[PDB]
Design an enzyme around this catalytic site. Sequence first.
Site, PDB file in Angstrom:
ATOM      1  N   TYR A 190       9.448   4.472  -0.736  1.00 25.61           N
ATOM      2  CA  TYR A 190       8.860   4.718   0.910  1.00 25.61           C
ATOM      3  C   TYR A 190       7.550   5.186   0.586  1.00 25.61           C
ATOM      4  O   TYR A 190       6.708   4.944   1.728  1.00 25.61           O
ATOM      5  CB  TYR A 190       9.704   5.646   1.519  1.00 25.61           C
ATOM      6  CG  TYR A 190      10.930   4.656   2.241  1.00 25.61           C
ATOM      7  CD1 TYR A 190      10.522   4.057   3.487  1.00 25.61           C
ATOM      8  CD2 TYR A 190      12.151   4.538   1.684  1.00 25.61           C
ATOM      9  CE1 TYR A 190      11.177   3.222   4.115  1.00 25.61           C
ATOM     10  CE2 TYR A 190      12.844   3.618   2.331  1.00 25.61           C
ATOM     11  CZ  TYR A 190      12.729   2.962   3.580  1.00 25.61           C
ATOM     12  OH  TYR A 190      13.378   1.970   4.307  1.00 25.61           O
ATOM     13  N   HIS A 226      16.192   8.833   4.361  1.00 27.98           N
ATOM     14  CA  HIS A 226      16.356   7.940   3.001  1.00 27.98           C
ATOM     15  C   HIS A 226      16.856   9.082   1.929  1.00 27.98           C
ATOM     16  O   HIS A 226      17.301   8.316   0.770  1.00 27.98           O
ATOM     17  CB  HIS A 226      15.207   7.297   2.717  1.00 27.98           C
ATOM     18  CG  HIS A 226      14.751   6.235   3.752  1.00 27.98           C
ATOM     19  ND1 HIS A 226      15.720   5.115   4.119  1.00 27.98           N
ATOM     20  CD2 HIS A 226      13.758   6.280   4.557  1.00 27.98           C
ATOM     21  CE1 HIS A 226      15.053   4.607   5.322  1.00 27.98           C
ATOM     22  NE2 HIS A 226      13.997   5.363   5.508  1.00 27.98           N
TER      23      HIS A 226
END
Lengths: 727, 727
Positions: free
Chosen positions: A250, A405
């Site tokens: 990410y 996440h």
Amino acid sequence: AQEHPSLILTKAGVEKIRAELGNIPIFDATLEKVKAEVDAEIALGIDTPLPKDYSGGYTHERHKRNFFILQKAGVLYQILNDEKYALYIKDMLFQYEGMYKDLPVHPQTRSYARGKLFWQCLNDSNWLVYVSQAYDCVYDYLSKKERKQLEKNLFRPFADYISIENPQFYNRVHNHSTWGNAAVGMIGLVMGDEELIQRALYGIEDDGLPIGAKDNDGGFIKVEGQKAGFLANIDEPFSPDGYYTEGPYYQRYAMYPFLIFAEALHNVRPQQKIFEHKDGVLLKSVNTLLSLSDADGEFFPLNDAQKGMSYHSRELVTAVDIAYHYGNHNPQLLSIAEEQGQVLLDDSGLAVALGIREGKSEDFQKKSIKLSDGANGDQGGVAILRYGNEAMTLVYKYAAQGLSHGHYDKLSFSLYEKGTEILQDYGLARFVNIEQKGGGNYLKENTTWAKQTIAHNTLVQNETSHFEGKYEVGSQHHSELYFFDASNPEVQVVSAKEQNAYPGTEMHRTMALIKTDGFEKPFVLDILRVGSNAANQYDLPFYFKGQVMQTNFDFTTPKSLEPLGSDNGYQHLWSEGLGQPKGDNSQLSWLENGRFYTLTTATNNDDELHFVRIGANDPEFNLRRDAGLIIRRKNTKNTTFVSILESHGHYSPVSEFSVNANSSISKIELMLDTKEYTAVLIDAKSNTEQTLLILANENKNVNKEHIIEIKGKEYRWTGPYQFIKIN
Amino acid sequence: AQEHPSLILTKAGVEKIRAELGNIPIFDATLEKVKAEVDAEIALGIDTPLPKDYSGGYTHERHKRNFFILQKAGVLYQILNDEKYALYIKDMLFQYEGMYKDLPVHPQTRSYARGKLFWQCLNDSNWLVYVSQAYDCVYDYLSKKERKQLEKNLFRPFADYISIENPQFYNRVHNHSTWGNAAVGMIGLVMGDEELIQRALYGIEDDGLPIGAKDNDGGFIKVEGQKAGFLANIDEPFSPDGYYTEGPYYQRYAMYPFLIFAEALHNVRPQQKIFEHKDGVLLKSVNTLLSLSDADGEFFPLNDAQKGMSYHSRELVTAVDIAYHYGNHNPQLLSIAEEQGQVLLDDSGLAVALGIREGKSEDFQKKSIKLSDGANGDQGGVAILRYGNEAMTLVYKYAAQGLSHGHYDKLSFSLYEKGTEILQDYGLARFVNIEQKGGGNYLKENTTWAKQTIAHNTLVQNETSHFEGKYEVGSQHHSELYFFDASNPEVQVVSAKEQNAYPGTEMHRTMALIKTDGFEKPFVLDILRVGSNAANQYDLPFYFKGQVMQTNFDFTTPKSLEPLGSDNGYQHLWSEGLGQPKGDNSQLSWLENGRFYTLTTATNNDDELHFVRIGANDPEFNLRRDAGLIIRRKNTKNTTFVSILESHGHYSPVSEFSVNANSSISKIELMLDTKEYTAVLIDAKSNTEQTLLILANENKNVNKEHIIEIKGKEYRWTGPYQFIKIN
Ligand SMILES: [Ca+2]
Ligand SMILES: [Ca+2]
Ligand SMILES: [Ca+2]
Ligand SMILES: [Mg+2]
Ligand SMILES: [Mg+2]
Ligand SMILES: [Mg+2]
Ligand SMILES: [Mg+2]
């Protein structure tokens, strides 16, 4: 007053590029490639379909390709001075203007912030970040009348849609909001609109969002006391080491809007001092992200992460070039650019190309590194221990939650040899942008398998994930660095503690990468010390990669595969075999990519050794059929796991020679196993090769002298550990 | 009178080599590498341990390394004119002479022909082939007295041990006997011993071996009326196309003794005309073997075969160089030598190096090819169909039994794309020379899984292998070529029949590699026509490689995995899912190495679609956990399976773009399904792209005119097939 273009590609940049064309191979090659890509799309025409699909489906891919092509056409127009590219941009922008204002909300309903062009506002924001760059390149080619219509009926309504109309998407500390803020800010900078620029920098005031509002990966929209806007997204999720808390997969994604909007702010609003913000964290974070890749440049699959994402991605071409040009001109970045084999078609890509031509490239050093987590660097971290010339790499994750996440994986590790994964972190359960797998979106098994503790190489207690797999609890916690000492290239040690994952249990895991006499290669030593207030069932998985070669224990092979357990990830493991230890050390060896590996672990008579395979309760074949060995220690309060992972020998199916296929470990033994001190004796099989690691567990001070006895012999040292040759 | 050396390296060759050293890079580099290897072993000393171990174990690997090093030292002595290497050879040979005569039979008891230095006579024979070359190189350096002792007390007894004392090993048509014959013949040629030379060429006279006795791989030791010796091993197991009946993995193995002993015979006994034997089959067979490799040079894993064996192996370096030097100097062989990056250190390697230096290299063409099996080319065969620039490769196996290493898989196929396996032939269950896996020897599961029909992509009837898995039956039978027509690069078709695998059932399988409008790439069309006299259960497996992406049929996922069946390989398959078709065509798609694939098959509503996983009844983890889809058609007499395998699109985890992920098949339909004619209509999703394949099944004559009616419309053509675009 304002020149166009000026945000990314500058007027002076265009002149410098034109002067150098033909004598900058990496740039020239990129230009030829991009020109061919755009020319092919121009031949195909202009398609702006009524949006319908998820990722991988036609309308998603078509609108996505359009934003990439528009930005490419913009720089081609400027660099080549060829109006065919400006005309295409004008025609496509006006075709968008003809449809966007009459669109409904996207018909797919999964997103917490449904887009207009795409299923989610994130992708509408991607589109505007890229299209703002194209608009900057054609601004002067368009008439005032044309600009007015596009701004009034396309760009301003679009910017409002992804911000004030969807504050749940826009006003967060999250990669989504970084993209949203950048989209609004980029178009604001091109148009000279102070309101939009302020909205980009500082977010929306008084958003009216309620408590406990979430999105779809288990994460809160807002966090108490946190600001909104671009500057908040720099300050909060980056540590002072430039580690982005969502993890490298990410971080890669967020690097594009962070560095592009920072570049634009630098060029248009230098008074913001954006590259100085948070002690220059954005520029530092590029180096940090590159350090979080394996020998092939593939990012370590920590938290939600698809394997294969690498520094060859468009985000890293962008980040490397911007960091080189606007930072201190780090020559190590040029070697990464050479590996990428392309540059941005702008001022920053030219700078990289010229640096390469001038012979300035230096190799990017991949080193052992300690990275802190949390805005102030006090919320755990991630450690990478590397041996030699990136010859073996251990990644130890003692981080904070990682937002939505994040995985339930305190003190987990993974191991790599020269770009080959040996002990894995599973990554995500998602086939990113592949329509056939749940619209390319996160799958059910991302939550039920990939995030769960049993899927990781770390301690599981009573078949329950860390923090009971509850996001709201995990979000309040982080593991704690005990010490990091990588100063000795032969004996690098890191240690961390976790006491909230399982309240009432203390986990203290020390990992070392050790080269010593008697072993061909460095090995990993893993000490996982557990203290508890109750008798528990402890599971310690090792998710190995490769073909099983040998064990030193017998195991049974069942006639049917049954799931290992019922909940918290255990429902996804088939029980493939059950072993009982033959003695104090149990060994499993395997062959992976032509090299042998051996796991040796200290076992008690009542331990169970479980061969498992992923894939139970997987009706759509969303999970890989990878294997693991799990040490199960039942009815136990305090215990200390001690393991070694060796790499040795080789095999080739061409030569058909098997070399050094056996372990060199004779014995591992706990000589002292107390709360205050741990001592592990390691005996090699060759000659008199014995070593002793001693750990002080309750005082990290580097100047503290320790005095202990083992078998009536005194050992003295200063600091939290000693590693000594026993003669 | 006889010069030494003369068999392989010649005295003229030594002079020619010495004159060119420093100006022949591929040779110079090899010489440097080999010199360093030998110098290192000289430093370590001379170790001739009491034999104890199986392959991968110390005594096996030490005696094996010794024979390789002795041959290398021989050519170094001659090329470098350095007695260091001759002295090492002398000292090692005499250390062998001190121990060999007092050895017992090897203490391991597995082999049908236990060795002395090694567990099996095959490996003792390897040793003598290599050591004979070393002896040729030091013959004049030794005294007459030294030679007499070595010949009397080492070489002659050794040659007898592997021949007249073990005729069951020596007097066969088998790779074992090829090695044994070459061993005896090579030492016979060095010594000028006519008796041994005759024993090598023509075998043992009146061997007395039992007919019907089996080796430990299940095949016969001796065939009634069959000759023995080297010439019989050229005549019998090679077809007139140079296809060795044991399959490519074993052809690779036998190429070394075939070409080395042929070279020696050519040099010492040119009157034998060895390179003319059987219409020059040995030279042809090198080209044939190279044609039996995938795009990365890895041999197709037909019959017992370890994946990864390739033309980079030492046997192929040898074969390529000898074929270049003693054949017609085929420049295509030089490109293979360039890929290998090394040459033999002898006359033949010099010839290759000089050919490369003179710019003669041409690319080795990898073509579609028909290869017959049987000594006279009338016992079935193997067909390879290749598209474009080796872009897709179909391997269709309609061969004879293949001797002991043969599998029970008449009409099986496998499929590759640019070196990536898509539909597999399993290969062997053995980890070759890895001691930890059953001494590196054939595993129980080679018989119970790998050889069985259910492990293959072909028809299985009533859960029984072809010929009931009985060697005594299968060895008497072969499939029969119906026709082969690869002349049209866009539409290549091969067809074969098998009526003895299941007495009372006729199998007629036609495979085509077809590029046509509406499809990105060529596809494979598979028509498996079955006729029987009884209602049977038919299983048709597809052992695919990759990650499942989508199906067009629902399937159930059981809560426990149970074996698919009880016997004949079914005990090694877990039942992972069970589907019923939704309609007339069922589809499975998957992703492998960045490319999508779709299998479409014509289904009846009572068909079962079984997802299976290899690994049941595998207590030692000897089998890979690969998957398959099996079409099960119960209670059926006559039926025709029709399938297409498409390759389409791509995915990258760097770009995260999925492109062309869906099938282009709209429909496949059996328009005519009779014993005399089969017709398959293929509809692409692009509505105007329709094609029809018609097969005449009972007359292969290329000039026979056919007139048939399909849906009231007449079709007329000549020959066994027609492929036509339907307008
Ligand atoms: Ca994880
Ligand atoms: Ca191939
Ligand atoms: Ca096979
Ligand atoms: Mg962010
Ligand atoms: Mg690495
Ligand atoms: Mg031995
Ligand atoms: Mg045997």
